[model samples]
Target: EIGTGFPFDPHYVEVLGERMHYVDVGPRDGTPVLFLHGNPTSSYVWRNIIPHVAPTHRCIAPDLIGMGKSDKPDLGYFFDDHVRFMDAFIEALGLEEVVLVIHDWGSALGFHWAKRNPERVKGIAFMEFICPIPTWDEWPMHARETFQAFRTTDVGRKLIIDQNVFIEGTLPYGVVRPLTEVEMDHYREPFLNPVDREPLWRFPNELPIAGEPANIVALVEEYMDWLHQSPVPKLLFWGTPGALIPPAEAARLAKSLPNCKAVDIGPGLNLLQEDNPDLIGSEIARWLSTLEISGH
Candidate 1:
């Protein structure tokens, strides 16, 4: 069992017939800030950052279905499956004028939602996420070796499904600062069994590779178009030598956005939340202050 060092109570809303769990804090009527976490992590990822902004904004962090306290049903946990639940989650909560704080898979999912419902989105802040992969050769040599292995062969299945490397190895290794035992336990407990680890196995496999999963490829392309074209305010928080979207790509991504700002949160890795939540939180709060929200 995991401990409540996080100190937030769990709340749930029905999305596609399962209980979608979330941590809702601060004033209910305050400006809505939806924090979306990625694979092998839950809403707990935002525990350190929530308090900094919650005083002025409503913070809602959800555990994507099958990955946290949320009910884990038997499913493939594909990109569409995630988007369906997320789309329903926002509608169920009646969240509007929302600022999306996203990481990893959260970026892919939330960006899609923001593009589809531009009027409802007030702003977006993202870090360490995936963008469209146009071709196999476009992947950096490092990505081809590590990420490609996760999606391509039997070794990938052994790592993700049988042995649970995504949680035990890949996640911990991606962070610059080592995670405490307690912190790691909270992340590990959710998928202790192979049966519960299906969500973990499916995410990497869904990455657009060799022109497979054409639907997801289409969605990624569409979202990129929307990202560059939309007049949405964006904050790109990155750390030193990002594990995924490194500095050069981060800069290019920022340039593509019509209204975007880039900030370095300092010596951290892909898991910047674990590395420097204070910096990430403060930067986001400062940026939010600049946006013309009704209450702010």
Candidate 2:
């Protein structure tokens, strides 16, 4: 339990005609801290992280439509597919002045939503997500080879779908601390069948690399435009030798992203939530104290 205890209850709401599961806790009226997780992980990633914020804020961590305990209905599970469902989830809940805690591909989805609904967002705290993936050549040396393998056609399918590599291999290997069998099993239970593994294979394929995934490539362009333009508060948590953003990108963002603050969260990597959720949660809680939390 990592000493934080996963004490959250489950709730489901209809998003796009499918029942999407979520963890909604803390005060009913506290300002919402909407946490969005990315590939191979679900809202479960936020279990320990939420406890820090939950005492003061209403924290909502919904499993994306096709991932976690949510119904894996037939769909491409494209980037926008997640965006659409997430947007509906927010509307269904009538969230306002949302403080976004986003990671991995979920950062993309959150940034896109926050960009479009600037009035609805109060702040954004981001870590370990793709940005301006200009080309696979520029992608981090540590991540490029693995992602390339996951994006390959038959090879990607065999590893991610057939062998269940994402949950068993990639996720565990990415975190700095080793995960317990119970935690791995919770992640594993969702995509047990090859058919259920489609999203696992698709996430890597959907990465807007080298001008591929053209729609999402376009979304990032828009995201960058909004990031530089918006006055929203952004807190960036970066790790040493981080696989995605790394040191240089975090430095660039500290200056580039408007009203942004960057914190070095020590030696954690891709899955910082698992590696250092206590630190991350505490850091975010401290930062939240400073924001004005406008339009509440």
Candidate 3:
């Protein structure tokens, strides 16, 4: 029962096999800006910035199948499935020339889509994640062992799915600032029980580490190739002390893209936007202006 007082009305669009949730705001004819959410967060993550930018741009934020209001089916949490659903999503809407605002796993998803239809992509803005190819060396001391154990056994799946660590642990790392009691309450709704939590368990178990992750790694390679070839006017926002995706990862990406521009806002972590929405918002707006002028 999340309110639609923000810019867009929350709606469900059928993709793959379930109803995928998204926020579609701004004038229908405006430029398209797609906001891709990270782990455990949905379109709600962009609640503050969407209104400001949606006036001139069509801002659509989707909760990837496993997260948000989207259908969290027990069988579909792999990155490959995520990309396929996104492909279906754009085709269903007949969207074109999209500017993707990517964060966390969404960065990987958005980039895969961009590479698939490079001409249709206008630009890409990355935050709290990297996608030339995902790098996870900086995972916190707590997560590395945790992710390893989880990936290795049935108990790990239970910890992620039944116990719902993926969603609950997010309250602490989801943002740099502590989520208000009200916000936490809103975030807690979907996983009210274990059955509602199966996809969460499946997502991590399916991550592509060294080799391609089943249906996922090929797209990652394709995306990296696209980034190296096409200069799709990239902008990266970095948090100085991210526990998950650190600023150094963004730096490595800049080295690869060469044309990419990255900015370190301040001291913080994953939920940088919650604490510094103005900074992130203004940066996106300015970058959009540049993209407009550049005619990408």
Candidate 4:
């Protein structure tokens, strides 16, 4: 396991006919705090952050199928595909009263599940994810082209499949501090082969660019409303000059959700977990404590 130094035991479960890897720590009967990662990263991203809450909460972090030690079956890693596996994971673990902590693609997939199973979700904390995409006409053209290029066959393959750019380039570039050789190797090990990198190649294609993924676009819109109206407690954490979800957007998200509050945790980029784990983890621990008393 790449998580040898992560101070937790790695476990696997049969879900969706594949071996899904996860780290389960703390008391089995404690409140479940489920952490989900985004593209090109895995459960290892939460190694430092999990300990802050583990003493009181059951910290459960799973590597999305095909992204970590999980089985990488031959399939396109679309938004729906990720959802299917996540649904299975919850069922396999019999998880309930979950506190979802999601980032990147995890936000998309997590919210989708949360909306449909709002009863199961006790609370949520999210960062660096698309809460909603504005109308296609309002989307910036430069951003449109940048996203489109990733889905374009030849270019997408060259950047993601051939070179593992999301892991090698995007992941490191988005972090504030440099990763050690061991950390980099842990991230790089899974996608060394082009065949194993299919999940990375397919994730960008699922981005709701120009309304291409109509179903996902609809899902995001639906969940945006769910977030606004649901009584579930929510926390929005933003980093300074975030790479994807900017502070302004984070503010908008905070304002829209009835029970949500936004906090700026200081300097970092997309991978704030690496930049400010202590701040992020402690803030969540404090916020989660409130939920227990609020009957959430």
Name the candidate that leads on TM-score: 2
Report the C-alpha lDDT of model 1 over 216-292, residue by residue, as the tens digit: 77887888889899898999998878866778888888788899999887876668898888888898999989988
State every prediction's TM-score relative to the real structure. Answer: 0.93, 0.94, 0.87, 0.92
Off by over 4 Å in 1: 1-4, 135-143
C-alpha lDDT (0 to 100) for residue 180 of candidate 2: 87
Model 4: residue 233 alpha-carbon error in angstroms: 0.6
Whole-model Cα lDDT of every candidate shown, in order? 0.84, 0.85, 0.72, 0.82
RMSD of 1: 2.6
Worst 10 residues of 2 by lDDT: 1-10
In candidate 2, stretches whose alpha carbon ends up further than 4 angstroms from where it belongs are 1-5, 140-142, 294-296
* lDDT, residue 98, candidate 4: 89
Tens digit of lDDT per residue, candidate 2, span 1-296? 47434588879998878999999987876568999999899998998889898887789999998998899989888887888899999998888668999999889989999888888888899999767687778656657887888989888888888989888888987787788888888888788778988888888898888888888788888887888899988999998767777789889999988899998888777888887788889988888888886223
